[PDB]
Amino acid sequence: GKKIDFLLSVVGFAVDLANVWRFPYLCYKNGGGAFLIPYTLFLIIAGMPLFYMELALGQYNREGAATVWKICPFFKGVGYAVILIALYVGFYYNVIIAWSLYYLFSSFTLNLPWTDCGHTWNSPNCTDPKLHTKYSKYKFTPAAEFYERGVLHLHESSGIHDIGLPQWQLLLCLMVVVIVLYFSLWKGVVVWITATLPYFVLFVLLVHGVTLPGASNGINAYLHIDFYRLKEATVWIDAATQIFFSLGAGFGVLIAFASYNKFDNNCYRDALLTSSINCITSFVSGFAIFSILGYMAHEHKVNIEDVATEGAGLVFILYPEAISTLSGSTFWAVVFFVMLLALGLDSSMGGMEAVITGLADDFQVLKRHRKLFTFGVTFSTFLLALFCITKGGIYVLTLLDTFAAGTSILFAVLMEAIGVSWFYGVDRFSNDIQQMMGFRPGLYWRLCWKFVSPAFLLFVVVVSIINFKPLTYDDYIFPPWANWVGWGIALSSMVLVPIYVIYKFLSTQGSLWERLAYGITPENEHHLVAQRDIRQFQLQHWLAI
């Protein structure tokens, strides 16, 4: 019983809606396997040590994302930045769950709406294989037609400048999701359903998609590595962003979750198991998705590179198509979309609780009024997600998914790593981990924390800034001002670090060096500053690993 509970806890903690929904289309856009090589490399090098670092910080300090920086006051700006990034992500992370709920509601019938066209939302150009040529993305399939016309109603929007009005069905779905999240978060701080359904679905998908008419060529395309594409840095940027998405680092979720953990909990084992399960699940998901889309390529008589969209919604075009060919399609559709709802709800409560804990640890008034604060956060998310359910809401969702995270999250995580490792001290961090868990981290962990991970993060951030491709959605090109809007969205969270550094420097009293010492010394050691004994002002601190 207890062993099963531990296994379920680890397995559920190792899964996210990202691994199931976002990895599919990032791997399909970025190549096949030319995405897994950067994915695995970054996973190990940065994601494992940084996941471990965030868990250890949260566990030892017993503070949220913002207040954990009492160890180094100057990085409370980084804390605020990660909180803001988590706030930004929710606006559309909760609209994907509205899509999932709409699909689940549609799944309750003996004739799935995505099996063939002939409905009201169907265009005259629909082609039913049972009943293009170039580089387009084949938006004339019954499943794609359903997703884009009976769900999104995208055909009524000419672009992000003509988004239109909110859809009254996705509106109700979002209302339901928002109410559920609030009522699940309004009291304080699911594993059985979440830790089992994703793996059952993934296993059945593998077993069924392997034996399909055209899965062989899809798998062949999956297992071909184009090293012409590792030489572009788009795959590397995507891999880094997806790693920090699936693992949960950079949003303040890990610190907030770990602040409630036991003081003697083992974070090294947690990081190891989470990373291993994440890698295995990502590889298997890529395999299954590529088999499914190779099958579609065979069925629709179109090239593997044009069967499906390369943006959000690839899963909502793929998984229904695979379900339609199973026996008892209604049962499997219901099961799969219930799994999607469970995963999305778990991740949404995780992010919202990260935000709430980070903001309530800072202010005691918010802590004393969890109900009102939770209602405010939930209502703000509901409104700024209503912004994304419009007719042209897929364009807004693409803009957000591209800009809210990405360079901003990479910068925030790099700043966190730099702060801890260099200013607070990797030696001090190792001593704290030893005190918590009884063993000092190995040399590999310290090197990754101090030198390797910050360097790779800096390289990725610099490349993502200097090598920026204008935003697009399949065959639609965003207007120039949309790119400025997205860059402003990213900068709104990136700039919070220097702003808080300047504010802290100005507010603090004393001379320049006194202000610096008060800014880099832990709040509980501020009585050393009067004694002129600061470790950071000695070469030994900066020359110690």
Ligand X SMILES: NCCc1ccc(O)c(O)c1
Tell me how far apart the alpha carbons of residues 99 and 384 are, in angstroms, rounded to a whole number: 16
CA distance 464 to 450: 22
33 labelled binding-site residue = no
Among 138, 245, 336, 411, binds ligand X (CB under 6 A): 245
Q: Which stretch binds ligand X (CB under 6 A): 23-31, 107-115, 431-439, 472-480?
A: 23-31
Smallest gap from residue 110 Cβ to ligand X (A): 34
> Are 225 and 32 a contacting pair, CB within 8 Å?
yes
Residues 202-221 that bind ligand X (CB under 6 A): 221
Q: Does 493 bind Cl ion (CB under 5 A)?
A: no
Q: What count of other Cβ atoms lies within 10 Å of the Cβ of residue 203?
A: 12
Which of 52, 93, 257, 373 is close enough to bind ligand X by CB under 6 A?
93
Helices (H) and strands (E) counted in the chain, each on its own, are 25, 2
Q: Which residues ranging from 1 to 20 are in contact with Cl ion (CB under 5 A)?
A: 19
Interacting partner of 23 out of Cl ion, ligand X, none (Cβ under 5 to 8 A depending on kind): Cl ion
The span from the CA of 105 to the CA of 97, in Å, is 12
Q: Which stretch binds ligand X (CB under 6 A): 26-34, 60-68, 151-159, 494-502?
A: 26-34
Is 12 annotated as ligand-binding? Answer: yes
Cα 41 from Cα 459, distance rounded (Å): 14
Task: Decide: residue 120, CB within 10 A, 0-12 exposed, 13-18 middle, 19+ buried.
Answer: exposed
Residues 502-521 that bind ligand X (CB under 6 A): none
C-alpha dihedral, 309 to 311 to 313 to 319, nearest 10°: 60
Q: Which residues are bridge partners to 390 per DSSP?
A: 166
User: Is position 329 annotated in a ligand binding site?
Assistant: no
Give the x-and-dash track for 249-288 against Cl ion (CB under 5 A).
Answer: ---------------------------------x------
30 is a site residue for Cl ion (CB under 5 A): no
**134 vs 527, beta carbon nearer ligand X:** 134
Whether 39 and 48 have beta carbons less than 8 Å apart is answered as: no
| Residues touching ligand X, count (CB under 6 A) | 23
- Give the burial string for 16-40 (b: 16+ CB within 10 Å, else e): bbbbbbbbbbbbbebbbbbbbbbbb
> Cα separation of 48 and 258, whole Å?
16
**Residue 365 known to bind ligand:** no
9 or 220, CB closer to ligand X?
Answer: 220
346 is in an annotated binding site: yes
Among 251, 287, 449, 473, binds ligand X (CB under 6 A): 251
Q: Smaller CB distance to ligand X: residue 253 or 471?
A: 253
Binding letters toward ligand X, positions 294-313, x by CB under 6 A: ----------xx--------
Buried b (16+ CB within 10 A) or exposed e, 469-486: eebebbebebeeebbebb
- Mask: binding to ligand X, 108-147, rule CB under 6 A, as x and -? ----------------------------------------
CA distance 314 to 28: 9
221 binding partner (options ligand X, Cl ion, none; Cβ < 5 to 8 Å by kind): ligand X
Alpha carbons 545 and 459: distance in angstroms, whole number: 22
Cα-trace Rg, the chain: 24
Sketch the per residue contact string, 92 through 131, with Cl ion: x for CB under 5 A, - otherwise: ----------------------------------------
Q: Assess 232 for contact with ligand X (CB under 6 A).
A: no
Considering only residues 33 through 62, tell me which ones interact with ligand X, judged by CB under 6 A. Answer: none
Residues that bind Cl ion (CB under 5 A): 19, 23, 242, 246, 282
Residues found near ligand X in the complex (CB under 6 A): 16, 18, 28-29, 31-32, 86, 89-90, 93-94, 221, 245, 248, 251, 253, 304-305, 347-348, 350-352
